[PDB]
Structure formats: C-alpha cells, structure tokens
Design an enzyme around this catalytic site. Sequence first.
Site, PDB file in Angstrom:
ATOM      1  N   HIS A 181      -6.491   5.120   0.687  1.00  0.00           N
ATOM      2  CA  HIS A 181      -5.330   4.611   0.523  1.00  0.00           C
ATOM      3  C   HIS A 181      -5.330   3.446  -0.630  1.00  0.00           C
ATOM      4  O   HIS A 181      -6.402   3.610  -1.491  1.00  0.00           O
ATOM      5  CB  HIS A 181      -4.919   3.639   1.614  1.00  0.00           C
ATOM      6  CG  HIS A 181      -5.469   4.375   3.058  1.00  0.00           C
ATOM      7  ND1 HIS A 181      -4.829   5.198   3.737  1.00  0.00           N
ATOM      8  CD2 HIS A 181      -6.809   4.423   3.459  1.00  0.00           C
ATOM      9  CE1 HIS A 181      -5.466   5.396   4.794  1.00  0.00           C
ATOM     10  NE2 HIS A 181      -6.588   5.189   4.679  1.00  0.00           N
TER      11      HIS A 181
ATOM     12  N   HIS B  92       0.995  -1.023   0.016  1.00  0.00           N
ATOM     13  CA  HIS B  92      -0.045  -0.010  -0.015  1.00  0.00           C
ATOM     14  C   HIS B  92       0.835   1.211   0.119  1.00  0.00           C
ATOM     15  O   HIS B  92       2.152   1.252   0.238  1.00  0.00           O
ATOM     16  CB  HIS B  92      -0.914   0.065   1.096  1.00  0.00           C
ATOM     17  CG  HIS B  92      -0.212   0.216   2.546  1.00  0.00           C
ATOM     18  ND1 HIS B  92      -0.510   1.252   3.469  1.00  0.00           N
ATOM     19  CD2 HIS B  92       0.954  -0.359   3.059  1.00  0.00           C
ATOM     20  CE1 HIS B  92       0.179   1.111   4.495  1.00  0.00           C
ATOM     21  NE2 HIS B  92       0.996   0.419   4.328  1.00  0.00           N
TER      22      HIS B  92
ATOM     23  N   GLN C  83      -6.519  -3.969   8.678  1.00  0.00           N
ATOM     24  CA  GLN C  83      -7.936  -3.527   8.511  1.00  0.00           C
ATOM     25  C   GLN C  83      -8.831  -4.295   7.741  1.00  0.00           C
ATOM     26  O   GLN C  83      -8.551  -4.833   6.681  1.00  0.00           O
ATOM     27  CB  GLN C  83      -8.065  -2.200   7.755  1.00  0.00           C
ATOM     28  CG  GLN C  83      -8.017  -0.795   8.809  1.00  0.00           C
ATOM     29  CD  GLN C  83      -9.270  -0.791   9.393  1.00  0.00           C
ATOM     30  OE1 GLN C  83      -8.873  -0.354  10.693  1.00  0.00           O
ATOM     31  NE2 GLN C  83     -10.516  -1.192   8.979  1.00  0.00           N
TER      32      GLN C  83
ATOM     33  N   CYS D 251       4.959   6.938   5.518  1.00  0.00           N
ATOM     34  CA  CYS D 251       5.905   7.045   6.731  1.00  0.00           C
ATOM     35  C   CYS D 251       6.481   5.805   7.133  1.00  0.00           C
ATOM     36  O   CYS D 251       7.721   5.604   7.076  1.00  0.00           O
ATOM     37  CB  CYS D 251       5.236   7.742   7.631  1.00  0.00           C
ATOM     38  SG  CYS D 251       6.228   8.247   9.163  1.00  0.00           S
TER      39      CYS D 251
ATOM     40  N   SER E  16      -8.261   5.106   7.514  1.00  0.00           N
ATOM     41  CA  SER E  16      -8.046   6.503   8.206  1.00  0.00           C
ATOM     42  C   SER E  16      -8.189   7.373   6.797  1.00  0.00           C
ATOM     43  O   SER E  16      -6.944   8.259   6.860  1.00  0.00           O
ATOM     44  CB  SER E  16      -7.165   6.722   9.312  1.00  0.00           C
ATOM     45  OG  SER E  16      -7.458   5.863  10.416  1.00  0.00           O
TER      46      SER E  16
END
Length: 163
Positions: A157, A59, A131, A113, A154
């Site tokens: 993505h 991802h 998830q 990140c 969140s």
Amino acid sequence: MADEEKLPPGWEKRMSRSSGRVYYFNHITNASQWERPSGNSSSGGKNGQGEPARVRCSHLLVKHSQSRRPSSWRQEKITRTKEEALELINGYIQKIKSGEEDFESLASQFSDCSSAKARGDLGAFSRGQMQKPFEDASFALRTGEMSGPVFTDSGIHIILRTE
C-alpha cells in the site's frame, strides 16, 4: 499498541457488525468489554520527535488474493497476489509525481474500493486509529512526501501526508 494482536489468548480483539463499537468479548465467561483487557499493562506510548497531533493522511491500497475475501468493484477478480503487485504502484508514482493525472482524479478512477467512495481517501489520521505500522507513515514524512509500497496491513500500500 497492546490492543490488537499483542494480547494473551483469551479475550482477543473483536468488532461489532452494527455500529462503530469495539470489544474483545470473553471466550469463557462470554462477557463483553470496552476494548483493552488491561490484564497486564497500563502505559507504553509516545516516541521522541515533533509529536504531530494529527495530519490528514491518504492511501491507495492495492489489495490482493491474500486478504480476507477479495472484493473490489470494477473487477471482482484478484489473483495477482503480492508477487506481481510491484508492477502497478511502482509505475503509478510517475503518474502522480508529474501531477499530470493528479491523485484527485486517479482517486475516483480506481483507488481501491471502500476508500474509493469519498474521492479516494479517508480523512484525518488522529492517534492512528489504524495499522500501527501504517499510521506511522503519515507521521514519518513531510506534507506531500508520499511513500511508495509499504509492507504492512495486508499486502502492498501507499500513504501520503496530505496535511
């Protein structure tokens, strides 16, 4: 799956900042458990398809000012929210779709990140481990069929089936 946000008000899923452990911890008794209260459940899985044992998933993760404590690395400033975030990944597909820049280089050049440490990636996605609505991504396409922006976790993505 009956162990995240679909449990009764009392135990609640929690984490232990120190190791790879996991528990809910009682709020009244203050006792620690081994995840899954089992106060009203037992089974409820499976699907009805090929049933892939495991498939390396990857991802990019955009992240916005909607998550918990915004912090990237190459830009400690995220105020684009999930409103104008559909103007970065949409065009990014044309970059990876052509293979000109490739996802490999584009991974260690941005990614997100945390996942942008191991060459923009994570590893093998087994039994999900993430998830529920997300893991189903690497298991809802063919080896290479990268999915666009997914509304889950969140924000926006992407998940590709990297075998």
